[PDB]
Design a protein around this ligand. Structure first.
Ligand SMILES: [Cl-]
Ligand SMILES: [Cl-]
Ligand SMILES: [Cl-]
Length: 163
């Protein structure tokens, strides 16, 4: 565990993270995909061997000894708000189980379902609160990766608000 488990946010490519493992915003079929998923495919392509997994689940594949936790959030184009919310919460609970099982002291994580799976809605708060619900009981240092300066400010504010 981390000596004083923390949350942090950084505005940069999660493929350049300084953590002991990464969470991919995966698609269910293990395809190279778009956005975060494509950056993860480019950096850790070996981790896409048998990475396909259902919506609401996480499957870890090693790249060398570096764990890639493929977490499949719902595409809010396809899911109802209600069902999508349930699956988005579930994907984060499976991420917490994987981070715990791996024994890492740190994890790089994107906000699931906030990009091409957002259904064109702003899901910063929805996605971040499900991240917190899942990860608060873990003792890993969590570093959230985002690309927008205003999302960085909002994520940083939400972290600092809880102390
Ligand atoms: Cl960058
Ligand atoms: Cl997404
Ligand atoms: Cl972002």
């Amino acid at each position: 565990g981390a000596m004083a488990p923390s949350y942090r946010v950084k505005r940069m490519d999660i493929a350049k993270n300084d953590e002991e493992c990464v969470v991919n915003a995966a698609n269910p079929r293990g395809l190279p995909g778009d956005g975060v998923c494509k950056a993860v495919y480019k950096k850790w392509p070996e981790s896409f061997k048998n990475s396909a997994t259902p919506v609401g689940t996480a499957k870890t594949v090693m790249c060398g000894t570096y764990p890639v936790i493929h977490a499949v959030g719902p595409n809010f184009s396809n899911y109802t708000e209600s069902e999508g919310d349930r699956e988005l919460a579930a994907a984060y609970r499976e991420v917490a189980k994987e981070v715990t099982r791996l024994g890492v002291n740190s994890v790089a994580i994107p906000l699931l379902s906030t990009g091409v799976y957002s259904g064109g809605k702003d899901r910063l708060t929805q996605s971040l609160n499900h991240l917190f619900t899942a990860m608060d009981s873990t003792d890993a240092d969590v570093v959230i990766y985002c690309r927008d300066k205003e999302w960085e400010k909002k994520i940083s504010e939400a972290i600092q608000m809880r102390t």
